[PDB]
Design a protein around this motif. Structure first.
Motif, PDB file in Angstrom:
ATOM      1  N   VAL A 177      57.641  20.868  39.823  1.00  0.00           N
ATOM      2  CA  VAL A 177      57.989  22.122  40.482  1.00  0.00           C
ATOM      3  C   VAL A 177      57.979  23.310  39.499  1.00  0.00           C
ATOM      4  N   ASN A 178      58.547  23.164  38.308  1.00  0.00           N
ATOM      5  CA  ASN A 178      58.522  24.259  37.300  1.00  0.00           C
ATOM      6  C   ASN A 178      57.084  24.629  36.900  1.00  0.00           C
ATOM      7  N   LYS A 179      56.213  23.627  36.859  1.00  0.00           N
ATOM      8  CA  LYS A 179      54.801  23.834  36.551  1.00  0.00           C
ATOM      9  C   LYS A 179      54.126  24.617  37.700  1.00  0.00           C
ATOM     10  N   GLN A 180      54.402  24.211  38.939  1.00  0.00           N
ATOM     11  CA  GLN A 180      53.781  24.858  40.068  1.00  0.00           C
ATOM     12  C   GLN A 180      54.309  26.297  40.179  1.00  0.00           C
ATOM     13  N   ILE A 181      55.578  26.538  39.823  1.00  0.00           N
ATOM     14  CA  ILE A 181      56.107  27.885  39.865  1.00  0.00           C
ATOM     15  C   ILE A 181      55.262  28.781  38.958  1.00  0.00           C
ATOM     16  N   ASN A 182      55.010  28.326  37.721  1.00  0.00           N
ATOM     17  CA  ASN A 182      54.162  29.053  36.770  1.00  0.00           C
ATOM     18  C   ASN A 182      52.759  29.260  37.344  1.00  0.00           C
ATOM     19  N   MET A 183      52.210  28.213  37.942  1.00  0.00           N
ATOM     20  CA  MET A 183      50.852  28.273  38.505  1.00  0.00           C
ATOM     21  C   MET A 183      50.756  29.316  39.652  1.00  0.00           C
ATOM     22  N   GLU A 184      51.799  29.455  40.476  1.00  0.00           N
ATOM     23  CA  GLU A 184      51.746  30.404  41.611  1.00  0.00           C
ATOM     24  C   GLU A 184      51.820  31.849  41.099  1.00  0.00           C
ATOM     25  N   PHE A 185      52.675  32.079  40.094  1.00  0.00           N
ATOM     26  CA  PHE A 185      52.775  33.391  39.447  1.00  0.00           C
ATOM     27  C   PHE A 185      51.446  33.732  38.774  1.00  0.00           C
ATOM     28  N   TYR A 186      50.791  32.733  38.174  1.00  0.00           N
ATOM     29  CA  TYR A 186      49.544  32.956  37.516  1.00  0.00           C
ATOM     30  C   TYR A 186      48.535  33.408  38.558  1.00  0.00           C
ATOM     31  N   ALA A 187      48.468  32.668  39.667  1.00  0.00           N
ATOM     32  CA  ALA A 187      47.534  33.074  40.727  1.00  0.00           C
ATOM     33  C   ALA A 187      47.861  34.496  41.230  1.00  0.00           C
ATOM     34  N   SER A 188      49.147  34.814  41.367  1.00  0.00           N
ATOM     35  CA  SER A 188      49.561  36.157  41.703  1.00  0.00           C
ATOM     36  C   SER A 188      48.968  37.213  40.758  1.00  0.00           C
ATOM     37  N   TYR A 189      49.052  36.935  39.456  1.00  0.00           N
ATOM     38  CA  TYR A 189      48.567  37.846  38.397  1.00  0.00           C
ATOM     39  C   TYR A 189      47.039  38.009  38.427  1.00  0.00           C
ATOM     40  N   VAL A 190      46.292  36.921  38.639  1.00  0.00           N
ATOM     41  CA  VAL A 190      44.839  37.007  38.794  1.00  0.00           C
ATOM     42  C   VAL A 190      44.478  38.009  39.898  1.00  0.00           C
ATOM     43  N   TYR A 191      45.133  37.883  41.044  1.00  0.00           N
ATOM     44  CA  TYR A 191      44.797  38.672  42.226  1.00  0.00           C
ATOM     45  C   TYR A 191      45.168  40.142  42.003  1.00  0.00           C
ATOM     46  N   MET A 192      46.279  40.356  41.321  1.00  0.00           N
ATOM     47  CA  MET A 192      46.677  41.687  40.882  1.00  0.00           C
ATOM     48  C   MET A 192      45.524  42.302  40.065  1.00  0.00           C
ATOM     49  N   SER A 193      44.976  41.537  39.121  1.00  0.00           N
ATOM     50  CA  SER A 193      43.869  42.018  38.278  1.00  0.00           C
ATOM     51  C   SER A 193      42.604  42.272  39.107  1.00  0.00           C
ATOM     52  N   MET A 194      42.319  41.386  40.044  1.00  0.00           N
ATOM     53  CA  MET A 194      41.155  41.612  40.895  1.00  0.00           C
ATOM     54  C   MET A 194      41.351  42.900  41.709  1.00  0.00           C
ATOM     55  N   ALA A 195      42.580  43.111  42.198  1.00  0.00           N
ATOM     56  CA  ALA A 195      42.850  44.222  43.046  1.00  0.00           C
ATOM     57  C   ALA A 195      42.620  45.507  42.255  1.00  0.00           C
ATOM     58  N   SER A 196      43.104  45.559  41.015  1.00  0.00           N
ATOM     59  CA  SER A 196      42.950  46.778  40.213  1.00  0.00           C
ATOM     60  C   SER A 196      41.483  46.986  39.807  1.00  0.00           C
ATOM     61  N   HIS A 197      40.719  45.896  39.646  1.00  0.00           N
ATOM     62  CA  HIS A 197      39.277  46.005  39.383  1.00  0.00           C
ATOM     63  C   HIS A 197      38.551  46.718  40.541  1.00  0.00           C
ATOM     64  N   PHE A 198      38.890  46.386  41.795  1.00  0.00           N
ATOM     65  CA  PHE A 198      38.183  46.978  42.938  1.00  0.00           C
ATOM     66  C   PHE A 198      38.716  48.374  43.292  1.00  0.00           C
ATOM     67  N   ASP A 199      39.757  48.839  42.603  1.00  0.00           N
ATOM     68  CA  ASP A 199      40.226  50.189  42.776  1.00  0.00           C
ATOM     69  C   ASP A 199      39.793  51.132  41.644  1.00  0.00           C
ATOM     70  N   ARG A 200      38.880  50.687  40.782  1.00  0.00           N
ATOM     71  CA  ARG A 200      38.292  51.542  39.775  1.00  0.00           C
ATOM     72  C   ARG A 200      37.378  52.557  40.461  1.00  0.00           C
ATOM     73  N   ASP A 201      37.332  53.782  39.941  1.00  0.00           N
ATOM     74  CA  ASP A 201      36.497  54.828  40.540  1.00  0.00           C
ATOM     75  C   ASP A 201      35.016  54.406  40.559  1.00  0.00           C
ATOM     76  N   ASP A 202      34.609  53.569  39.597  1.00  0.00           N
ATOM     77  CA  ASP A 202      33.207  53.122  39.430  1.00  0.00           C
ATOM     78  C   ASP A 202      32.980  51.805  40.179  1.00  0.00           C
ATOM     79  N   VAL A 203      33.959  51.338  40.964  1.00  0.00           N
ATOM     80  CA  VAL A 203      33.775  50.132  41.780  1.00  0.00           C
ATOM     81  C   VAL A 203      34.105  50.457  43.248  1.00  0.00           C
ATOM     82  N   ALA A 204      35.351  50.903  43.499  1.00  0.00           N
ATOM     83  CA  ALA A 204      35.691  51.622  44.706  1.00  0.00           C
ATOM     84  C   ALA A 204      35.358  50.819  45.986  1.00  0.00           C
ATOM     85  N   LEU A 205      35.895  49.599  46.100  1.00  0.00           N
ATOM     86  CA  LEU A 205      35.817  48.802  47.302  1.00  0.00           C
ATOM     87  C   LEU A 205      37.233  48.570  47.841  1.00  0.00           C
TER      88      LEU A 205
END
Ligand code: CL
Ligand code: CL
Ligand code: CL
Ligand code: CL
Ligand code: CL
Ligand code: CL
Ligand code: CL
Ligand code: CL
Ligand code: CL
Ligand code: CL
Ligand code: CL
Ligand code: CL
Ligand code: CL
Ligand code: CL
Ligand code: CL
Ligand code: CL
Ligand code: CL
Ligand code: CL
Ligand code: CL
Ligand code: CL
Ligand code: CL
Ligand code: CL
Ligand code: CL
Ligand code: CL
Ligand code: CL
Ligand code: CL
Ligand code: CL
Ligand code: CL
Ligand code: CL
Ligand code: CL
Ligand code: CL
Ligand code: CL
Ligand code: CL
Ligand code: CL
Ligand code: CL
Ligand code: CL
Ligand code: CL
Ligand code: CL
Ligand code: CL
Ligand code: CL
Ligand code: CL
Ligand code: CL
Ligand code: CL
Ligand code: CL
Ligand code: CL
Ligand code: CL
Ligand code: CL
Ligand code: CL
Ligand code: CL
Ligand code: CL
Ligand code: CL
Ligand code: CL
Ligand code: CL
Ligand code: CL
Ligand code: CL
Ligand code: CL
Ligand code: CL
Ligand code: CL
Ligand code: CL
Ligand code: CL
Ligand code: CL
Ligand code: CL
Ligand code: CL
Ligand code: CL
Ligand code: CL
Ligand code: CL
Ligand code: CL
Ligand code: CL
Ligand code: CL
Ligand code: CL
Ligand code: CL
Ligand code: CL
Ligand code: CL
Ligand code: CL
Ligand code: CL
Ligand code: CL
Ligand code: CL
Ligand code: CL
Ligand code: CL
Ligand code: CL
Ligand code: CL
Ligand code: CL
Ligand code: CL
Ligand code: CL
Ligand code: CL
Ligand code: CL
Ligand code: CL
Ligand code: CL
Ligand code: CL
Ligand code: CL
Ligand code: CL
Ligand code: CL
Ligand code: CL
Ligand code: CL
Ligand code: CL
Ligand code: CL
Ligand code: CL
Ligand code: CL
Ligand code: CL
Ligand code: CL
Ligand code: CL
Ligand code: CL
Ligand code: CL
Ligand code: CL
Ligand code: CL
Ligand code: CL
Ligand code: CL
Ligand code: CL
Ligand code: CL
Ligand code: CL
Ligand code: CL
Ligand code: CL
Ligand code: CL
Ligand code: CL
Ligand code: CL
Ligand code: CL
Ligand code: CL
Ligand code: CL
Ligand code: CL
Ligand code: CL
Ligand code: CL
Ligand code: CL
Ligand code: CL
Ligand code: CL
Ligand code: CL
Ligand code: CL
Ligand code: FE
Ligand code: FE
Ligand code: FE
Ligand code: FE
Ligand code: FE
Ligand code: FE
Ligand code: FE
Ligand code: FE
Ligand code: FE
Ligand code: FE
Ligand code: FE
Ligand code: FE
Ligand code: FE
Ligand code: FE
Ligand code: FE
Ligand code: FE
Ligand code: FE
Ligand code: FE
Ligand code: FE
Ligand code: FE
Ligand code: FE
Ligand code: FE
Ligand code: FE
Ligand code: FE
Ligand code: FE
Ligand code: FE
Ligand code: FE
Ligand code: FE
Ligand code: FE
Ligand code: FE
Ligand code: FE
Ligand code: FE
Ligand code: NA
Ligand code: NA
Ligand code: NA
Ligand code: NA
Ligand code: NA
Ligand code: NA
Ligand code: NA
Ligand code: NA
Ligand code: NA
Ligand code: NA
Ligand code: NA
Ligand code: NA
Ligand code: NA
Ligand code: NA
Ligand code: NA
Ligand code: NA
Ligand code: NA
Ligand code: NA
Ligand code: NA
Ligand code: NA
Ligand code: NA
Ligand code: NA
Ligand code: NA
Ligand code: NA
Ligand code: NA
Ligand code: NA
Ligand code: NA
Ligand code: NA
Ligand code: NA
Ligand code: NA
Ligand code: NA
Ligand code: NA
Ligand code: NA
Ligand code: NA
Ligand code: NA
Ligand code: NA
Ligand code: NA
Ligand code: NA
Ligand code: NA
Ligand code: NA
Ligand code: NA
Ligand code: NA
Ligand code: NA
Ligand code: NA
Ligand code: NA
Ligand code: NA
Ligand code: NA
Ligand code: NA
Ligand code: NA
Ligand code: NA
Ligand code: NA
Ligand code: NA
Ligand code: NA
Ligand code: NA
Ligand code: NA
Ligand code: NA
Ligand code: NA
Ligand code: NA
Ligand code: NA
Ligand code: NA
Ligand code: NA
Ligand code: NA
Ligand code: NA
Ligand code: NA
Ligand code: NA
Ligand code: NA
Ligand code: NA
Ligand code: NA
Ligand code: NA
Ligand code: NA
Ligand code: NA
Ligand code: NA
Ligand code: NA
Ligand code: NA
Ligand code: NA
Ligand code: NA
Ligand code: NA
Ligand code: NA
Ligand code: NA
Ligand code: NA
Ligand code: NA
Ligand code: NA
Ligand code: NA
Ligand code: NA
Ligand code: NA
Ligand code: NA
Ligand code: NA
Ligand code: NA
Ligand code: NA
Ligand code: NA
Ligand code: NA
Ligand code: NA
Ligand code: NA
Ligand code: NA
Ligand code: NA
Ligand code: NA
Ligand code: NA
Ligand code: NA
Ligand code: NA
Ligand code: NA
Ligand code: NA
Ligand code: NA
Lengths: 168, 168, 168, 168, 168, 168
Positions: free
Chosen positions: B15-43
């Motif tokens: 369970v402690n491992k999966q907790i880390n894994m879910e936060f990690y997945a959260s962080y990836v998606y945060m990064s993807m989200a900010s990538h698609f909000d770049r003025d030079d990407v803009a989706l």
């Protein structure tokens, strides 16, 4: 980037640092919240208060991420370090650690403002004043009064009752 | 802890491992989200979709934290590692990386189920089935169909229009 | 019986045992409730909480009776033994005894699940997971936190105030 | 006990006896209800009627428990003996057994009234008249008419249709 | 297929078999429904009950088709064989055949669960438990009680009246 | 059968044939629907359109079953043969096959009308005109226009967008 204007590379880096710092504060509060939801601690007011605090800190990070992209910077993520402790002690101990955290974050926000003033970035200064500096002052004052009342209430029954009163 | 019963130390660690894994997945998606909000990407569809995905992954982590305390385990946090990339490429590239992430998380959930079955923890197995395994199957199927449609739409105009259709 | 299918005589007997066990738990809580409504004890929160607990345990018995008939078993009743004590002591003592009761019932539910898994009765396993195992985990965690807070509040005034807070 | 006044130890014991008797009647009806929900019996009106009867008898017990504490007695629980039969036969057989049960309970209530009159306990007499004696007379008259109509309807189709009409 | 994960070729084939089996059950009930709508049979309750049963079985097939695609299997259709009879006899005969059908389908569902457990497919097991196994238990118990009441009611008038009561 | 009048054995057989043909068309559309819900095909408009088409064809079968019993015929079921293909290709390929299916069904309906005219069955002719012939003409015209627009839109992006527009 076609939108960047009057946005200095030091300010962009400062924003990336503050983004990490807000997520870190989010993670601390998450840990405090789970500490007060242990069966052997069981302070439901504290739990809810730190869970809400963790969620607010995530918002603060997310507004900075947005600001980075609005100004035509590039968000750069770093590791979110685990908090210093696995156990936060009594409600008084946790609230002291929370005060320390908020003051550390406040000092970083004031350094970031100083960076934007120094590079003549009035829009960045106003963004920081408008969304962060007064919010920080309220949160620090808030936690400080809790600390005063936790010492007034004393341990045992006082802690139980102070905890009831936390969210309202 | 007065509540712990039929909860094996290997399951608690899982369970402690999966907790880390879910936060990690959260962080990836945060990064993807900010990538698609770049003025030079803009989706803007991708931005909103990955921002919502990041928020869902944080919920998945938080339900596991709760589960740990309900069963009388001790939550133990680790660092949330930064994602593998700073830039995620086209909407097709990001969606491929997202499929890989969800399958990695799905495999960890199936190992965690296997751990709970092995230690005869029927309540933990049901918790995982009820809140995680079907949700994972839907998310993987969902992303896979997006990938098929991104290849059908092609680059340029197809990507713009596929992006419009993302959230509805 | 025209409906019986894949329902082993050991499982039927296990269900009859659990039916007795749920009624027994119902009777304990009834006794606790009447203890806290004595003029010389007079803790109205505890009274109401154990009266509601007694009623819930009767429901748990009744869902098992139903399950027995749905699967084409024969319900067989035994005596409902009187509880071990006539007086349950302080709210802390009663809550400790209640924790012991819920854990005893939880262990019987886990043995019953083990019986259904052993006889390859997936429908019985799911019935038990779906309606009993998570409910048991919540109730045990709940009572355990009460015990922690009863020790935090202390005897006398603390017990009066903890009692106010019981139902909400 | 600071509240006890004009409450004789024989009356207190009589109330503890009636508490056991009401729970016993509750348990009989529970057994009848599960008998009529067998796949090979399948009389849903009877099921519902005896399930409601079982619930009413539990209320009757609970009002007596309350009365014991209101008057400053001590509730003392005994075993709730299992019913005399595992199978109750036809709807006519069960209703005959139910009539016998209600008359047995009625006779105990009349002995309890006689005990309270004998010890000059007018408040206890009125409690019994007000909440129990007329309710008993109605229930006995009710079951008796059902018996008359079950004999009028005859076995087979008559029993099916009489069963439809039971609750309304 | 980009979505397939932990989905064994034997399970995929088992799902294709169950899809055929659910459509088959749908077709049987369609035939029963048209039998009870013959001018020389004319039992409108049975008609409506088997028409609704046929529609439910089509849903059961369709949820399995969906499940196949969610997990990244390939649906493979076979012929839907005609039912064993052109005429189903009395309402008692049809209900007996329906009981036999539901038990045959139930046994196939339990073999399918056994296949998913054997191949360590917890998501497939839960899908089957959640949407099929309890529904099957209720339907079999339901039909069995109808059979008991059809024998209680007898032929002629009893069959007419039992038929009125079927849907409500 | 007391209701049969002016209903020729050839017409009854023709109705039984059309019943099989409508179920067959239902099954084809079911297969098309599951083809477009594959993760590697993923055209949700087509899926929904063929799922609705499958459901409509089942209604067409069911109105004929009813008609058979209204006129005092005997419904006789045959096997519902599996469709010719396991994979239906592009949305253009499927829609071409659907056009072929609807025209085949339309020709059978026109042969059935011809049978009823030939046997001087005006009520059967009107039933067919009223509920089937105009519905068939609309469906064929509808699918034909889709085919024209699928060729106008072209493969890739055109297929994605034509699919969006399918249901509205
Ligand atoms: Cl500058
Ligand atoms: Cl501690
Ligand atoms: Cl806050
Ligand atoms: Cl912003
Ligand atoms: Cl923006
Ligand atoms: Cl980085
Ligand atoms: Cl740090
Ligand atoms: Cl660290
Ligand atoms: Cl500490
Ligand atoms: Cl400390
Ligand atoms: Cl500290
Ligand atoms: Cl700082
Ligand atoms: Cl400065
Ligand atoms: Cl400054
Ligand atoms: Cl500076
Ligand atoms: Cl300056
Ligand atoms: Cl802020
Ligand atoms: Cl403040
Ligand atoms: Cl302020
Ligand atoms: Cl304050
Ligand atoms: Cl304390
Ligand atoms: Cl263990
Ligand atoms: Cl780029
Ligand atoms: Cl999502
Ligand atoms: Cl949880
Ligand atoms: Cl909790
Ligand atoms: Cl740590
Ligand atoms: Cl990593
Ligand atoms: Cl790293
Ligand atoms: Cl890349
Ligand atoms: Cl890439
Ligand atoms: Cl990738
Ligand atoms: Cl993994
Ligand atoms: Cl395992
Ligand atoms: Cl396993
Ligand atoms: Cl394992
Ligand atoms: Cl094991
Ligand atoms: Cl989840
Ligand atoms: Cl999905
Ligand atoms: Cl699903
Ligand atoms: Cl899609
Ligand atoms: Cl592109
Ligand atoms: Cl067996
Ligand atoms: Cl006492
Ligand atoms: Cl409770
Ligand atoms: Cl049940
Ligand atoms: Cl039932
Ligand atoms: Cl017995
Ligand atoms: Cl005992
Ligand atoms: Cl005893
Ligand atoms: Cl004691
Ligand atoms: Cl004690
Ligand atoms: Cl104890
Ligand atoms: Cl036990
Ligand atoms: Cl086992
Ligand atoms: Cl086990
Ligand atoms: Cl066992
Ligand atoms: Cl086994
Ligand atoms: Cl329960
Ligand atoms: Cl809880
Ligand atoms: Cl829970
Ligand atoms: Cl608590
Ligand atoms: Cl005390
Ligand atoms: Cl006296
Ligand atoms: Cl019997
Ligand atoms: Cl009654
Ligand atoms: Cl009372
Ligand atoms: Cl009172
Ligand atoms: Cl006793
Ligand atoms: Cl007895
Ligand atoms: Cl006995
Ligand atoms: Cl008998
Ligand atoms: Cl008898
Ligand atoms: Cl008798
Ligand atoms: Cl008596
Ligand atoms: Cl007397
Ligand atoms: Cl008298
Ligand atoms: Cl007397
Ligand atoms: Cl007297
Ligand atoms: Cl009464
Ligand atoms: Cl009456
Ligand atoms: Cl009256
Ligand atoms: Cl009457
Ligand atoms: Cl009878
Ligand atoms: Cl495998
Ligand atoms: Cl016939
Ligand atoms: Cl049904
Ligand atoms: Cl599904
Ligand atoms: Cl889907
Ligand atoms: Cl095939
Ligand atoms: Cl067959
Ligand atoms: Cl055949
Ligand atoms: Cl027959
Ligand atoms: Cl037959
Ligand atoms: Cl048969
Ligand atoms: Cl089978
Ligand atoms: Cl197996
Ligand atoms: Cl198995
Ligand atoms: Cl197997
Ligand atoms: Cl295995
Ligand atoms: Cl189902
Ligand atoms: Cl049922
Ligand atoms: Cl059920
Ligand atoms: Cl029934
Ligand atoms: Cl008949
Ligand atoms: Cl003719
Ligand atoms: Cl393909
Ligand atoms: Cl259509
Ligand atoms: Cl019709
Ligand atoms: Cl009709
Ligand atoms: Cl045939
Ligand atoms: Cl064919
Ligand atoms: Cl074929
Ligand atoms: Cl093809
Ligand atoms: Cl083709
Ligand atoms: Cl074709
Ligand atoms: Cl044709
Ligand atoms: Cl003609
Ligand atoms: Cl013609
Ligand atoms: Cl012709
Ligand atoms: Cl002619
Ligand atoms: Cl039509
Ligand atoms: Cl049209
Ligand atoms: Cl038209
Ligand atoms: Cl068109
Ligand atoms: Cl294409
Ligand atoms: Fe610049
Ligand atoms: Fe902050
Ligand atoms: Fe503490
Ligand atoms: Fe300024
Ligand atoms: Fe804050
Ligand atoms: Fe343990
Ligand atoms: Fe997740
Ligand atoms: Fe791009
Ligand atoms: Fe389950
Ligand atoms: Fe399970
Ligand atoms: Fe479930
Ligand atoms: Fe997800
Ligand atoms: Fe069996
Ligand atoms: Fe229970
Ligand atoms: Fe006390
Ligand atoms: Fe409980
Ligand atoms: Fe007295
Ligand atoms: Fe009574
Ligand atoms: Fe009977
Ligand atoms: Fe009664
Ligand atoms: Fe696989
Ligand atoms: Fe089914
Ligand atoms: Fe008949
Ligand atoms: Fe299992
Ligand atoms: Fe069914
Ligand atoms: Fe004729
Ligand atoms: Fe048609
Ligand atoms: Fe295609
Ligand atoms: Fe006409
Ligand atoms: Fe005409
Ligand atoms: Fe007309
Ligand atoms: Fe059509
Ligand atoms: Na700047
Ligand atoms: Na930086
Ligand atoms: Na920089
Ligand atoms: Na940086
Ligand atoms: Na953001
Ligand atoms: Na945002
Ligand atoms: Na952004
Ligand atoms: Na801004
Ligand atoms: Na800028
Ligand atoms: Na950075
Ligand atoms: Na650290
Ligand atoms: Na400072
Ligand atoms: Na400053
Ligand atoms: Na800074
Ligand atoms: Na500058
Ligand atoms: Na303030
Ligand atoms: Na305190
Ligand atoms: Na465990
Ligand atoms: Na761990
Ligand atoms: Na551990
Ligand atoms: Na750990
Ligand atoms: Na949480
Ligand atoms: Na939570
Ligand atoms: Na927690
Ligand atoms: Na749980
Ligand atoms: Na536990
Ligand atoms: Na850890
Ligand atoms: Na990393
Ligand atoms: Na894998
Ligand atoms: Na697994
Ligand atoms: Na794991
Ligand atoms: Na173990
Ligand atoms: Na899905
Ligand atoms: Na694209
Ligand atoms: Na069994
Ligand atoms: Na037993
Ligand atoms: Na048995
Ligand atoms: Na037994
Ligand atoms: Na029951
Ligand atoms: Na019940
Ligand atoms: Na029952
Ligand atoms: Na059940
Ligand atoms: Na069964
Ligand atoms: Na027993
Ligand atoms: Na005892
Ligand atoms: Na135990
Ligand atoms: Na177990
Ligand atoms: Na057991
Ligand atoms: Na067995
Ligand atoms: Na809980
Ligand atoms: Na206390
Ligand atoms: Na008295
Ligand atoms: Na007594
Ligand atoms: Na006494
Ligand atoms: Na006594
Ligand atoms: Na009571
Ligand atoms: Na009461
Ligand atoms: Na009481
Ligand atoms: Na009273
Ligand atoms: Na008194
Ligand atoms: Na007694
Ligand atoms: Na007995
Ligand atoms: Na008498
Ligand atoms: Na009397
Ligand atoms: Na008496
Ligand atoms: Na006296
Ligand atoms: Na009356
Ligand atoms: Na009768
Ligand atoms: Na599998
Ligand atoms: Na197969
Ligand atoms: Na296969
Ligand atoms: Na196959
Ligand atoms: Na489907
Ligand atoms: Na579907
Ligand atoms: Na599908
Ligand atoms: Na699923
Ligand atoms: Na899969
Ligand atoms: Na097949
Ligand atoms: Na056949
Ligand atoms: Na079987
Ligand atoms: Na099985
Ligand atoms: Na099977
Ligand atoms: Na396998
Ligand atoms: Na049932
Ligand atoms: Na009958
Ligand atoms: Na004709
Ligand atoms: Na024919
Ligand atoms: Na014919
Ligand atoms: Na024919
Ligand atoms: Na029909
Ligand atoms: Na119809
Ligand atoms: Na019909
Ligand atoms: Na007609
Ligand atoms: Na006719
Ligand atoms: Na035929
Ligand atoms: Na074929
Ligand atoms: Na033609
Ligand atoms: Na024609
Ligand atoms: Na024809
Ligand atoms: Na003719
Ligand atoms: Na038209
Ligand atoms: Na096209």
């Amino acid at each position: 980037s076609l939108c960047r204007q009057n946005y200095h590379e030091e300010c962009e880096a400062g924003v990336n640092k503050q983004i990490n710092m807000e997520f870190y504060a989010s993670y601390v509060y998450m840990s405090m919240a789970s500490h007060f939801d242990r069966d052997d601690v069981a302070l439901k007011g504290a739990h809810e208060f730190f869970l809400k605090s963790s969620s607010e800190e995530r918002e603060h990070a997310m507004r900075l991420i947005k600001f980075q992209n609005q100004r035509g910077g590039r968000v750069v993520y770093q590791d979110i370090k685990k908090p210093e402790k696995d156990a936060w002690g009594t409600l008084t101990d946790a609230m002291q650690a929370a005060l320390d955290l908020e003051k550390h974050v406040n000092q970083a926000l004031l350094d970031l403002h100083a960076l934007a003033s120094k590079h003549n970035d009035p829009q960045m200064c106003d963004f920081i004043e408008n969304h962060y500096l007064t919010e920080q002052v309220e949160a620090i004052r808030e936690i400080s009064g809790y600390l005063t009342n936790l010492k007034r209430c004393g341990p045992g029954l006082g802690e139980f009752l102070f905890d009831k009163e936390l969210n309202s």
